[PDB]
């Protein structure tokens, strides 16, 4: 549903009339939420095939790498500064407000921002936070080469790319220089 | 609860059940059927790196490159690039320049 | 390499929250007979796990020890 | 392994059978354990005042009502078990299953592979040819007149016997086959 | 060896490079790396697969179709003349509708070129290409399946009518 | 081979690699954090501003 | 032979003998309505999904949900797992219509507002040199454009 | 995981022990619960259930309400996850 | 007094929330011991040639057979001319055709139409 | 063209003075070889067509037509050698007889360039039909099919007869080049309606055509899986054929004429494609997605247009080859289970994996995955109605649609799911089958790369 | 969006339409007023392939980025100045056009106020 939203997102962003930041956010976009798949599938993997967040719980120091790469990931969906969401999200966001728009389109999508930020927050907290609800034979292991090297390249990539890509892209849109602060 | 014929025959196919899946258990010998690549020690390292690189990046760009010649030739408009941006630089062909003005206010 | 499960009676509601709940319940006249099974859950490693915001500040501390490393070396060196 | 079932359900059966999901539908809604036992424990009190109500007619209505709180408060997304149906695991490797059948038609080739196996397998053949007939018997003699009024098998009577009918629940395919 | 004239390309104007900075630039090592590894292989092979088709060089002809009198001029069920001028037709036909084909590879490839400067830079092929599909849809368009001399040349008479009465 | 042995009821082994990387991706992101924000800070570029006077653009008043 | 179906049974004696030859209970078998729609004798079963059945029962044929020998619903291949599920919801069927419908409604009619009020910003419209791009937009350079002209403030 | 029937029976005493309505001294593999026990029909729900969140796998309630025993448990979880020793 | 389930033909009742599943009679049980000795005879009989060693093939279901011949070939036989079938064939077998020859007859009309008074783009359409 | 046809009568005294035990192998050999000289016949000139003598020629639509039916011929005789190999000698010669005359009939009607020569070799075909489903037929209801089949195809036929003697009468000859280079129009007179008619109706029902398709259902369930491919593959196109032959003779009439015709397809098609929703058999659904596909090059040839024509024969021969592998593949599983009922065999992926792959190849054809020739002439059909029409898009997405959902769905219940219990006759598939298996699809997918093959005359 | 708040919420008539402006002519008012000047010629946008909606009037600070970006890859760090360059200019016309939407409200109220002065 996270993917599905952020798919509205770039959407919004073709609305706008500011393609080429819809193909930047389609970029980060890759990085991000391949990775907090993948941190779902070990979650998954190590609980004997359960997704139920609710059968889920005391994850943050039972698997550290993958609540790292989780959290990095949901900051970077959330759009927190200088990581890969803060070069295309932000930018969508205030090019949003910065035009011509149909009003509750414009409500809709900081509503949904919002939203954004509660569910990445469900999924932090059901799963990784709290006391562990899971059967008791417990045989979480994330020490798999493949699995944490796998893990790595895409943190990386969301921590770095987006700074890189920006950088290295030609302007392609008139930025909004001034806008108000709030 | 149980009735005592129910008991009886859920014991008696137990029992046969656990015996067909320890039938069901592979046997220490598991005869494969017995050399077409005489390589033994192919240096793992990287032997099969090299050859890897070779055969599936190397050959296949040396094909499209010899097929870059033969159809950009054959016919016109094959590839056709986008034409280089030109800035108030020099041209290589004709050695053109131009600068833009720079009548424009230094300070900001 | 067998497993060996864990004394029985080394899990006990006291120190937990389900010491709670049952105060609660002895309250109201009921007695829960599980807590016992529940406790592991509560207990040992498992039984402290940080807040959401301690969550996202992690590695908050060497982060900014190694921001305020580079930020000398970058005002010294000019 | 399921057993067969009854014509109804008895009341008791009922009630059972709705503690057992009202209990599971509070663990859904109540996520966290603690209050998941605080309010179970509430839950086997609310059982246990009518426990003993002698009136059928009473019980009846307080079953049916609490049905209908059950229906009400259900949650949307109950918890289902992995492997368990509607689980996200369900069914997930039935193509792996084959059929013991399938075996025979290997080609001998194949069969040359794991000799010691289908040694094993033919002995297993011998018994149950051997074993039909006198199934078959045992179903007839204890099958009532009319006919059997219940999916229940009788065990073996004697020794020497096997169960009637026991092939397929023997031999079905592992549960995860691979 | 297609004729520029047929297929025109604007003159290449390549900027020269001018770095400014000290840092190696990775394209330039990349682009040489290929060229020894890649091109040169490529290029010899060339050179020995010319060798051998420059020592056994054979010609193949263009052919040359005399024109024949037109359906116009030919009577009614006269099927030998009607045969001739009616694969003539079908010939002009094609070669009508290659003629559409270059122009429009002209302008596809001036599409592609010229870059964010389509528009403007492109209006010429675009004429042609305007005037070019006015001239088949006139003559060609609207036959149908079982197009024939005869058909295009109703089509025509029909147009000619019209002009005539547009006249008054 | 056994490198991490299940553990019934009590947390499972953590070798010390996972430790390690996890933190040191943790920090190194919140270490780019802090150092993009002390260089670059996107909070503004020029406060949006207000043209109060009227003879700047226009004046008549009749 | 007598085992297929046939025509709507009448007398009581024809409505036993296809209640036998469907393998149900007398009272239990109902014909389709005799409408001259073709159902015939064959059995108006309820109309549930297989979704419904019980999971746990051992069926005859478990993907199905089915038995051996029991009557088979006219329209099982519509009603199979896969296909048209019939099972109770949480909540009714026309309360979770009224509130689908009603959302789609209410967001459509609050983007025909949003249309009515588009929000923007307080600037002016965008400037471009030379007659807004007149040329480079694609108009007729022959035919002078008509003079644009943009004033510094 | 194995899960042997050893691991298997090792476990359903586990959360039988830590029961509190079951008494652990007198609790063996035979105790009936309905007899030997003094547990009722709810707790017969309540151990099935504890049973299934442990071992993370269902038993339909028809033979749930039929077990009636700890061996029963042991032996019918066996069968389910195909453990022949 | 929580809100009723109202059951629709895409929602069915739940058992629990049948009205009839708490006014049980004795014919009922009666009924329902019959049904289960309807399944449980044909269960054996399935379950015998299911496990017989000899049989090799399909375990043929007249069931089956019954519903093939029931959607297929029983239809026309025990059809009857209706006011209700003739009603219902006529609209949903002809009525269609008329309504798409209405919609497309009256866009070809109008296209030839402009095509006609040179008021319609056909610039760049040399394909058709 | 008698390089072709000479040899295809030989195939005949081969079969019959053959060995017992040769039979088959004798008739694919030189069936092959014979489909090899028919490759000949794609090298058409653009301009004109290849007129071999005053009573045959050849064109771009003739050539992929005949090549279909050379290939066919082998491929028949290799699903048939199963079921009829208790058949004894001369049956089995007769039977192999039957399809040689037909190839030869159909041969020399793709080829005849006389339109009463093309109307009685066209005819003909419907006696070795005929025998085929009402002989060797294994259901009761293959007399029914039979007499479905020849009275519909007759009552359609005869009035082309009339027209066609009429047509000779009044133009002086049916030879069709000189009726191509002549070709007067028609006139809006109710005397030339029905001239338009009885041209017309005889194709309208070869290929099946809503209202006219009750005969295609019966008698593809009914009949023998040769007898079927050739139904699917090559006895439905000869309708296209006639038809895009046929409509020179009526140009202006063809507009007013077309719209009863156009609309009855146009929704036939999506009401066949709902129907093969709710089939209850295998070969039913097949036959139903066949009707489907001819309706849309019905639809084709009324336009007539050029882009029209091109996708009418590219999905005249995908088509065929496609029904013909789908009902090969049902035929496979009626064998091993003896019953044609979708629900009965389930789960057969598991136990037949590389049948289920061929199914899948079938299926991804059947609901047109591009570049595949199914889609092409789809596309190009599609294309040409849009311009007719903008208002044909939604009828024709709405039929891909179906026909996506239920080639998935027959894919989806045959091939997958748990595996019925009871059946214990399934056997790892014979080389044969997969061999027919993969000669139907080889060609499909080769004949992407070179698509101008089967674009027909107007490419 | 307060601006919105007094178009929608108040009177219409004092706000600016935004489609509509600017209505009042620009010699109203400002006596002089200097034609806005295009560093960058046509020609030398059309060879840089700029796009049409970035060829505006702080076109020749964006060629001298896109000429800084070319010459200094690989380091794509080095045209911070020239970056700040174009995007100050870019602020001066946003608040070139703000001004103008001033401009057009208080002309509005102008022209309400001499309606009122006729009443």
Same mark, same amino acid.
């Given at each position: 549903?996270?993917?599905?939203?952020?798919?509205?997102?770039?959407?919004?962003?073709?609305?706008? *009339?500011?393609?080429?930041?819809?193909?930047?956010?389609?970029?980060?976009?890759?990085?991000?939420?391949?990775?907090?798949?993948?941190?779902?599938?070990?979650?998954?993997?190590?609980?004997?095939?359960?997704?139920?967040?609710?059968?889920?719980?005391?994850?943050?120091?039972?698997?550290?790498?993958?609540?790292?790469?989780?959290?990095?990931?949901?900051?970077?969906?959330?759009?927190?500064?200088?990581?890969?969401?803060?070069?295309?999200?932000?930018?969508?966001?205030?090019?949003?407000?910065?035009?011509?728009?149909?009003?509750?389109?414009?409500?809709?999508?900081?509503?949904?921002?919002?939203?954004?930020?509660?569910?990445?927050?469900?999924?932090?907290?059901?799963?990784?936070?709290?006391?562990?609800?899971?059967?008791?034979?417990?045989?979480?292991?994330?020490?798999?080469?493949?699995?944490? *090297?796998?893990?790595?390249?895409?943190?990386?990539?969301?921590?770095?790319?987006?700074?890189?890509?920006?950088? *290295?892209?030609?302007?392609?849109?008139?930025? *909004?220089?001034?806008?108000?602060?709030? | 609860? !149980?009735?005592?014929?129910?008991?009886?025959?859920?014991?008696?196919?137990?029992?046969?059940?656990?015996?067909?899946?320890?039938?069901?258990?592979?046997?220490?010998?598991?005869?494969?059927?017995?050399?077409?690549?005489?390589?033994?020690?192919?240096?793992?390292?990287?032997?099969?790196?090299?050859?890897?690189?070779?055969?599936?990046?190397?050959?296949?760009?040396?094909?499209?490159?010899? !097929?870059?010649?033969?159809?950009?030739?054959?016919?016109?408009?094959?590839?056709?690039?986008?034409?280089?941006?030109?800035?108030?630089?020099?041209?290589?062909?004709?050695?053109?320049?131009?600068?833009?003005?720079?009548?424009?206010?230094?300070?900001? | 390499?067998?497993?060996?499960?864990?004394?029985?009676?080394?899990?006990?509601?006291?120190?937990?929250?389900?010491?709670?709940?049952?105060?609660?319940?002895?309250?109201?006249?009921?007695?829960?007979?599980?807590?016992?099974?529940?406790?592991?859950?509560?207990?040992?490693?498992? /039984?402290?796990?940080?807040?959401?915001?301690?969550?996202?500040?992690?590695?908050?501390?060497?982060?900014?020890?190694?921001?305020?490393? /580079?930020?000398?070396?970058?005002?010294?060196?000019? | 392994?399921?057993?067969?079932?009854?014509?109804?359900?008895?009341?008791?059966?009922?009630?059972?059978?709705?503690?057992?999901?009202?209990?599971?539908?509070?663990?859904?809604?109540?996520?966290?354990?603690?209050? =998941?036992?605080?309010?179970?424990?509430?839950?086997?009190?609310?059982?246990?005042?009518?426990?003993?109500?002698?009136?059928?007619?009473?019980?009846?209505?307080?079953?049916?009502?609490?049905?209908?709180?059950?229906?009400?408060?259900?949650?949307?997304?109950?918890?289902?078990?992995?492997?368990?149906?509607?689980?996200?695991?369900?069914?997930? =490797?039935?193509?792996?299953?084959?059929?013991?059948?399938?075996?025979?038609?290997?080609?001998?080739?194949?069969?040359?592979?794991?000799?010691?196996?289908?040694?094993?397998?033919?002995?297993?053949?011998?018994?149950?040819?051997?074993?039909?007939?006198?199934?078959?018997?045992?179903?007839?003699?204890?099958?009532?007149?009319?006919?059997?009024?219940?999916?229940?098998?009788?065990?073996?009577?004697?020794?020497?016997?096997?169960?009637?009918?026991?092939?397929?629940?023997?031999?079905?395919?592992?549960?995860?086959?691979? | 060896?297609?004729?520029?004239?047929?297929?025109?390309?604007?003159?290449?104007?390549?900027?020269?490079?001018?770095?400014?900075?000290?840092?190696?630039?990775?394209?330039?090592?990349?682009?040489?790396?290929?060229?020894?590894?890649?091109?040169?292989?490529?290029?010899?092979?060339?050179?020995?697969?010319?060798?051998?088709?420059?020592?056994?060089?054979?010609?193949?002809?263009?052919?040359?179709?005399?024109?024949?009198?037109?359906?116009?001029?030919?009577?009614?069920?006269?099927?030998?003349?009607?045969?001739?001028?009616?694969?003539?037709?079908?010939?002009?036909?094609?070669?009508?509708?290659?003629?559409?084909?270059?122009?429009?590879?002209?302008?596809?490839?001036?599409?592609?070129?010229?870059?964010?400067?389509?528009?403007?830079?492109?209006?010429?092929?675009?004429?042609?290409?305007?005037?070019?599909?006015?001239?088949?849809?006139?003559?060609?368009?609207?036959?149908?399946?079982?197009?024939?001399?005869?058909?295009?040349?109703?089509?025509?008479?029909?147009?000619?009518?019209?002009?005539?009465?547009?006249?008054? | 081979?056994?490198?991490?042995?299940?553990?019934?009821?009590?947390?499972?082994?953590?070798?010390?690699?996972?430790?390690?990387?996890?933190?040191?991706?943790?920090?190194?992101?919140?270490?780019?954090?802090?150092?993009?924000?002390?260089?670059?800070?996107?909070?503004?570029?020029?406060?949006?501003?207000?043209?109060?006077?009227?003879?700047?653009?226009?004046?008549?008043?009749? | 032979?007598?085992?297929?179906?046939?025509?709507?049974?009448?007398?009581?004696?024809?409505?036993?003998?296809?209640?036998?030859?469907?393998?149900?209970?007398?009272?239990?078998?109902?014909?389709?309505?005799?409408?001259?729609?073709?159902?015939?004798?064959?059995?108006?079963?309820?109309?549930?999904?297989?979704?419904?059945?019980?999971?746990?029962?051992?069926?005859?044929?478990?993907?199905?949900?089915?038995?051996?020998?029991?009557?088979?619903?006219?329209?099982?291949?519509?009603?199979?797992?896969?296909?048209?599920?019939?099972?109770?919801?949480?909540?009714?069927?026309?309360?979770?219509?009224?509130?689908?419908?009603?959302?789609?409604?209410?967001?459509?009619?609050?983007?025909?507002?949003?249309?009515?009020?588009?929000?923007?910003?307080?600037?002016?419209?965008?400037?471009?040199?030379?007659?807004?791009?007149?040329?480079?937009?694609?108009?007729?350079?022959?035919?002078?454009?008509?003079?644009?002209?943009?004033?510094?403030? | 995981?194995?899960?042997?029937?050893?691991?298997?029976?090792?476990?359903?005493?586990?959360?039988?022990?830590?029961?509190?309505?079951?008494?652990?001294?007198?609790?063996?593999?035979?105790?009936?619960?309905?007899?030997?026990?003094?547990?009722?029909?709810?707790?017969?729900?309540?151990?099935?259930?504890?049973?299934?969140?442990?071992?993370?796998?269902?038993?339909?309630?028809?033979?749930?309400?039929?077990?009636?025993?700890?061996?029963?448990?042991?032996?019918?979880?066996?069968?389910?996850?195909?453990?022949?020793? | 007094?929580?809100?009723?389930?109202?059951?629709?033909?895409?929602?069915?009742?739940?058992?629990?929330?049948?009205?009839?599943?708490?006014?049980?009679?004795?014919?009922?049980?009666?009924?329902?011991?019959?049904?289960?000795?309807?399944?449980?005879?044909?269960?054996?009989?399935?379950?015998?040639?299911?496990?017989?060693?000899?049989?090799?093939?399909?375990?043929?279901?007249?069931?089956?057979?019954?519903?093939?011949?029931?959607?297929?070939?029983?239809?026309?036989?025990?059809?009857?001319?209706?006011?209700?079938?003739?009603?219902?064939?006529?609209?949903?077998?002809?009525?269609?055709?008329?309504?798409?020859?209405?919609?497309?007859?009256?866009?070809?009309?109008?296209?030839?139409?402009?095509?006609?008074?040179?008021?319609?783009?056909?610039?760049?359409?040399?394909?058709? | 063209?008698?390089?072709?046809?000479?040899?295809?009568?030989?195939?005949?005294?081969?079969?019959?003075?053959?060995?017992?035990?040769?039979?088959?192998?004798?008739?694919?050999?030189?069936?092959?070889?014979?489909?090899?000289?028919?490759?000949?016949?794609?090298?058409?000139?653009?301009?004109?067509?290849?007129?071999?003598?005053?009573?045959?020629?050849?064109?771009?639509?003739?050539?992929?037509?005949?090549?279909?039916?050379?290939?066919?011929?082998?491929?028949?005789?290799?699903?048939?050698?199963?079921?009829?190999?208790?058949?004894?000698?001369?049956?089995?010669?007769?039977?192999?007889?039957?399809?040689?005359?037909?190839?030869?009939?159909?041969?020399?009607?793709?080829?005849?360039?006389?339109?009463?020569?093309?109307?009685?070799?066209?005819?003909?075909?419907?006696?070795?039909?005929?025998?085929?489903?009402?002989?060797?037929?294994?259901?009761?209801?293959?007399?029914?099919?039979?007499?479905?089949?020849?009275?519909?195809?007759?009552?359609?036929?005869?009035?082309?007869?009339?027209?066609?003697?009429?047509?000779?009468?009044?133009?002086?000859?049916?030879?069709?080049?000189?009726?191509?280079?002549?070709?007067?129009?028609?006139?809006?007179?109710?005397?030339?309606?029905?001239?338009?008619?009885?041209?017309?109706?005889?194709?309208?029902?070869?290929?099946?055509?809503?209202?006219?398709?009750?005969?295609?259902?019966?008698?593809?369930?009914?009949?023998?899986?040769?007898?079927?491919?050739?139904?699917?593959?090559?006895?439905?196109?000869?309708?296209?054929?006639?038809?895009?032959?046929?409509?020179?003779?009526?140009?202006?009439?063809?507009?007013?004429?077309?719209?009863?015709?156009?609309?009855?397809?146009?929704?036939?098609?999506?009401?066949?494609?709902?129907?093969?929703?709710?089939?209850?058999?295998?070969?039913?659904?097949?036959?139903?997605?066949?009707?489907?596909?001819?309706?849309?090059?019905?639809?084709?040839?009324?336009?007539?247009?050029?882009?029209?024509?091109?996708?009418?024969?590219?999905?005249?021969?995908?088509?065929?080859?496609?029904?013909?592998?789908?009902?090969?593949?049902?035929?496979?599983?009626?064998?091993?289970?003896?019953?044609?009922?979708?629900?009965?065999?389930?789960?057969?992926?598991?136990?037949?994996?590389?049948?289920?792959?061929?199914?899948?190849?079938?299926?991804?054809?059947?609901?047109?995955?591009?570049?595949?020739?199914?889609?092409?002439?789809?596309?190009?059909?599609?294309?040409?109605?849009?311009?007719?029409?903008?208002?044909?898009?939604?009828?024709?997405?709405?039929?891909?649609?179906?026909?996506?959902?239920?080639?998935?769905?027959?894919?989806?219940?045959?091939?997958?799911?748990?595996?019925?219990?009871?059946?214990?006759?399934?056997?790892?598939?014979?080389?044969?089958?997969?061999?027919?298996?993969?000669?139907?699809?080889?060609?499909?997918?080769?004949?992407?790369?070179?698509?101008?093959?089967?674009?027909?005359?107007?490419? | +969006?307060?601006?919105?708040?007094?178009?929608?919420? +108040?009177?219409?008539?004092?706000?600016?339409?935004?489609?509509?402006?600017?209505?009042?002519?620009?010699?109203? +008012?400002?006596?002089?007023?200097?034609?806005?000047?295009?560093?960058?010629?046509?020609?030398?946008?059309?060879?840089?392939?700029?796009?049409?909606?970035?060829?505006?009037?702080?076109?020749?600070?964006?060629?001298?980025?896109?000429?800084?970006?070319?010459?200094?890859?690989?380091?794509?760090?080095?045209?911070?100045?020239?970056?700040?360059?174009?995007?100050?200019?870019?602020?001066?016309?946003?608040?070139?056009?703000?001004?103008?939407?001033?401009?057009?409200?208080?002309?509005?109220?102008?022209?309400?106020?001499?309606?009122?002065?006729?009443?």
């Amino acid at each position: 549903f996270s993917t599905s939203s952020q798919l509205g997102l770039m959407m919004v962003t073709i609305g706008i *009339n500011q393609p080429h930041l819809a193909f930047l956010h389609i970029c980060m976009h890759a990085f991000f939420k391949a990775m907090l798949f993948m941190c779902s599938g070990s979650i998954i993997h190590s609980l004997n095939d359960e997704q139920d967040i609710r059968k889920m719980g005391g994850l943050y120091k039972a698997m550290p790498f993958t609540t790292t790469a989780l959290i990095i990931g949901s900051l970077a969906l959330t759009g927190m500064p200088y990581l890969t969401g803060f070069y295309s999200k932000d930018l969508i966001i205030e090019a949003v407000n910065m035009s011509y728009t149909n009003a509750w389109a414009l409500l809709m999508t900081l509503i949904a921002t919002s939203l954004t930020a509660a569910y990445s927050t469900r999924i932090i907290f059901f799963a990784f936070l709290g006391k562990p609800r899971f059967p008791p034979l417990v045989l979480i292991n994330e020490n798999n080469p493949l699995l944490i *090297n796998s893990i790595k390249r895409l943190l990386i990539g969301s921590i770095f790319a987006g700074f890189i890509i920006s950088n *290295n892209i030609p302007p392609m849109t008139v930025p *909004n220089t001034t806008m108000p602060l709030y | 609860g !149980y009735t005592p014929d129910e008991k009886l025959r859920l014991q008696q196919l137990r029992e046969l059940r656990r015996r067909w899946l320890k039938d069901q258990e592979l046997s220490p010998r598991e005869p494969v059927l017995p050399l077409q690549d005489g390589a033994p020690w192919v240096i793992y390292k990287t032997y099969r790196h090299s050859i890897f690189a070779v055969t599936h990046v190397l050959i296949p760009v040396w094909i499209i490159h010899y !097929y870059l010649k033969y159809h950009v030739t054959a016919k016109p408009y094959t590839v056709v690039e986008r034409k280089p941006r030109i800035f108030p630089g020099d041209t290589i062909l004709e050695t053109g320049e131009v600068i833009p003005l720079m009548k424009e206010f230094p300070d900001q | 390499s067998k497993m060996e499960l864990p004394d029985y009676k080394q899990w006990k509601i006291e120190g937990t929250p389900l010491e709670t709940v049952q105060e609660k319940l002895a309250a109201r006249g009921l007695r829960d007979p599980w807590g016992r099974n529940e406790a592991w859950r509560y207990s040992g490693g498992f /039984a402290n796990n940080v807040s959401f915001v301690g969550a996202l500040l992690k590695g908050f501390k060497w982060g900014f020890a190694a921001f305020v490393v /580079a930020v000398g070396a970058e005002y010294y060196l000019e | 392994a399921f057993s067969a079932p009854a014509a109804y359900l008895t009341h008791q059966q009922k009630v059972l059978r709705l503690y057992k999901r009202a209990l599971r539908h509070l663990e859904s809604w109540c996520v966290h354990r603690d209050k =998941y036992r605080y309010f179970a424990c509430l839950m086997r009190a609310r059982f246990d005042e009518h426990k003993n109500e002698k009136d059928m007619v009473k019980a009846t209505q307080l079953l049916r009502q609490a049905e209908e709180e059950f229906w009400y408060g259900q949650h949307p997304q109950p918890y289902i078990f992995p492997e368990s149906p509607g689980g996200t695991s369900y069914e997930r =490797y039935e193509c792996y299953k084959v059929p013991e059948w399938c075996l025979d038609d290997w080609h001998p080739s194949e069969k040359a592979m794991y000799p010691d196996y289908f040694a094993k397998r033919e002995q297993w053949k011998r018994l149950r040819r051997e074993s039909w007939e006198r199934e078959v018997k045992q179903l007839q003699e204890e099958t009532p007149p009319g006919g059997p009024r219940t999916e229940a098998l009788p065990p073996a009577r004697k020794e020497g016997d096997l169960p009637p009918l026991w092939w397929h629940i023997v031999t079905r395919p592992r549960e995860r086959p691979m | 060896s297609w004729d520029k004239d047929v297929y025109p390309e604007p003159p290449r104007r390549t900027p020269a490079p001018a770095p400014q900075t000290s840092l190696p630039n990775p394209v330039t090592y990349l682009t040489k790396i290929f060229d020894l590894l890649v091109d040169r292989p490529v290029t010899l092979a060339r050179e020995f697969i010319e060798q051998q088709h420059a020592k056994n060089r054979y010609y193949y002809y263009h052919r040359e179709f005399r024109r024949v009198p037109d359906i116009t001029e030919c009577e009614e069920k006269d099927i030998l003349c009607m045969f001739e001028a009616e694969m003539q037709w079908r010939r002009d036909y094609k070669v009508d509708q290659e003629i559409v084909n270059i122009i429009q590879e002209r302008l596809k490839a001036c599409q592609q070129r010229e870059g964010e400067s389509y528009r403007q830079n492109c209006a010429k092929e675009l004429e042609q290409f305007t005037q070019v599909s006015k001239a088949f849809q006139d003559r060609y368009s609207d036959l149908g399946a079982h197009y024939s001399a005869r058909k295009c040349l109703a089509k025509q008479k029909q147009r000619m009518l019209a002009e005539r009465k547009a006249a008054k | 081979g056994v490198h991490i042995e299940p553990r019934y009821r009590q947390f499972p082994q953590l070798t010390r690699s996972q430790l390690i990387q996890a933190e040191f991706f943790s920090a190194t992101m919140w270490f780019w954090i802090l150092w993009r924000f002390w260089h670059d800070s996107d909070a503004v570029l020029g406060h949006f501003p207000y043209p109060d006077p009227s003879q700047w653009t226009d004046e008549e008043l009749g | 032979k007598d085992m297929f179906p046939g025509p709507y049974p009448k007398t009581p004696e024809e409505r036993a003998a296809a209640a036998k030859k469907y393998n149900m209970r007398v009272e239990d078998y109902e014909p389709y309505p005799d409408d001259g729609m073709g159902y015939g004798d064959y059995p108006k079963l309820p109309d549930r999904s297989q979704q419904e059945r019980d999971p746990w029962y051992d069926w005859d044929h478990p993907d199905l949900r089915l038995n051996w020998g029991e009557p088979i619903h006219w329209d099982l291949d519509m009603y199979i797992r896969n296909r048209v599920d019939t099972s109770p919801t949480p909540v009714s069927w026309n309360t979770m219509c009224k509130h689908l419908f009603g959302f789609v409604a209410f967001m459509l009619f609050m983007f025909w507002v949003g249309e009515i009020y588009p929000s923007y910003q307080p600037v002016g419209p965008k400037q471009y040199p030379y007659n807004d791009l007149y040329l480079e937009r694609g108009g007729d350079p022959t035919k002078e454009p008509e003079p644009v002209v943009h004033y510094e403030i | 995981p194995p899960l042997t029937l050893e691991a298997i029976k090792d476990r359903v005493l586990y959360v039988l022990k830590l029961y509190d309505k079951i008494d652990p001294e007198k609790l063996s593999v035979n105790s009936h619960f309905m007899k030997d026990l003094g547990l009722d029909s709810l707790d017969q729900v309540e151990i099935i259930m504890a049973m299934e969140d442990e071992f993370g796998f269902e038993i339909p309630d028809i033979d749930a309400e039929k077990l009636m025993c700890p061996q029963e448990i042991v032996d019918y979880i066996a069968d389910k996850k195909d453990v022949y020793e | 007094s929580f809100p009723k389930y109202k059951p629709s033909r895409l929602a069915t009742l739940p058992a629990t929330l049948d009205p009839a599943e708490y006014d049980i009679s004795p014919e009922t049980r009666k009924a329902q011991a019959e049904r289960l000795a309807i399944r449980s005879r044909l269960k054996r009989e399935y379950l015998l040639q299911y496990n017989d060693p000899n049989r090799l093939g399909v375990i043929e279901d007249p069931a089956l057979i019954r519903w093939t011949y029931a959607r297929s070939a029983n239809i026309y036989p025990n059809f009857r001319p209706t006011p209700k079938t003739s009603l219902l064939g006529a609209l949903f077998g002809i009525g269609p055709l008329f309504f798409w020859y209405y919609v497309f007859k009256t866009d070809r009309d109008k296209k030839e139409k402009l095509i006609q008074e040179g008021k319609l783009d056909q610039t760049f359409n040399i394909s058709y | 063209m008698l390089k072709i046809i000479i040899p295809t009568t030989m195939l005949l005294p081969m079969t019959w003075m053959s060995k017992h035990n040769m039979i088959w192998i004798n008739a694919t050999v030189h069936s092959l070889l014979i489909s090899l000289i028919s490759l000949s016949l794609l090298n058409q000139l653009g301009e004109n067509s290849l007129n071999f003598s005053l009573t045959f020629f050849s064109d771009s639509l003739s050539a992929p037509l005949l090549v279909l039916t050379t290939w066919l011929l082998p491929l028949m005789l290799m699903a048939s050698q199963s079921h009829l190999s208790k058949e004894t000698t001369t049956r089995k010669k007769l039977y192999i007889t039957m399809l040689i005359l037909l190839q030869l009939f159909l041969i020399m009607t793709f080829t005849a360039t006389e339109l009463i020569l093309f109307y009685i070799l066209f005819e003909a075909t419907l006696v070795p039909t005929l025998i085929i489903i009402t002989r060797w037929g294994n259901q009761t209801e293959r007399l029914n099919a039979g007499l479905y089949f020849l009275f519909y195809t007759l009552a359609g036929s005869l009035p082309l007869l009339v027209a066609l003697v009429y047509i000779q009468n009044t133009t002086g000859s049916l030879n069709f080049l000189i009726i191509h280079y002549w070709s007067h129009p028609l006139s809006n007179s109710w005397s030339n309606i029905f001239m338009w008619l009885a041209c017309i109706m005889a194709f309208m029902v070869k290929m099946p055509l809503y209202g006219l398709h009750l005969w295609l259902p019966k008698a593809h369930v009914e009949a023998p899986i040769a007898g079927s491919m050739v139904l699917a593959a090559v006895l439905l196109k000869l309708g296209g054929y006639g038809m895009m032959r046929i409509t020179t003779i009526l140009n202006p009439l063809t507009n007013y004429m077309a719209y009863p015709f156009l609309m009855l397809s146009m929704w036939g098609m999506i009401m066949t494609s709902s129907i093969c929703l709710r089939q209850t058999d295998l070969k039913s659904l097949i036959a139903y997605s066949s009707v489907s596909h001819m309706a849309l090059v019905i639809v084709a040839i009324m336009i007539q247009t050029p882009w029209s024509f091109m996708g009418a024969t590219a999905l005249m021969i995908a088509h065929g080859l496609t029904s013909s592998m789908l009902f090969c593949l049902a035929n496979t599983n009626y064998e091993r289970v003896h019953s044609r009922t979708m629900i009965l065999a389930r789960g057969l992926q598991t136990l037949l994996p590389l049948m289920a792959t061929w199914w899948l190849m079938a299926s991804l054809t059947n609901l047109a995955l591009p570049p595949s020739i199914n889609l092409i002439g789809e596309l190009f059909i599609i294309t040409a109605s849009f311009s007719w029409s903008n208002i044909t898009i939604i009828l024709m997405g709405m039929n891909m649609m179906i026909t996506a959902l239920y080639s998935l769905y027959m894919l989806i219940t045959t091939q997958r799911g748990k595996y019925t219990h009871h059946i214990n006759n399934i056997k790892a598939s014979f080389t044969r089958e997969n061999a027919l298996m993969a000669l139907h699809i080889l060609p499909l997918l080769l004949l992407t790369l070179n698509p101008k093959m089967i674009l027909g005359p107007l490419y | +969006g307060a601006h919105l708040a007094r178009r929608y919420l +108040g009177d219409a008539s004092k706000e600016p339409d935004p489609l509509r402006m600017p209505t009042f002519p620009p010699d109203y +008012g400002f006596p002089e007023r200097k034609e806005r000047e295009m560093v960058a010629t046509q020609q030398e946008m059309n060879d840089a392939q700029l796009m049409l909606q970035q060829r505006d009037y702080c076109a020749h600070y964006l060629i001298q980025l896109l000429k800084c970006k070319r010459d200094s890859f690989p380091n794509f760090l080095a045209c911070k100045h020239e970056q700040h360059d174009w995007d100050y200019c870019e602020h001066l016309d946003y608040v070139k056009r703000m001004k103008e939407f001033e401009r057009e409200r208080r002309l509005l109220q102008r022209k309400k106020r001499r309606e009122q002065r006729e009443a």
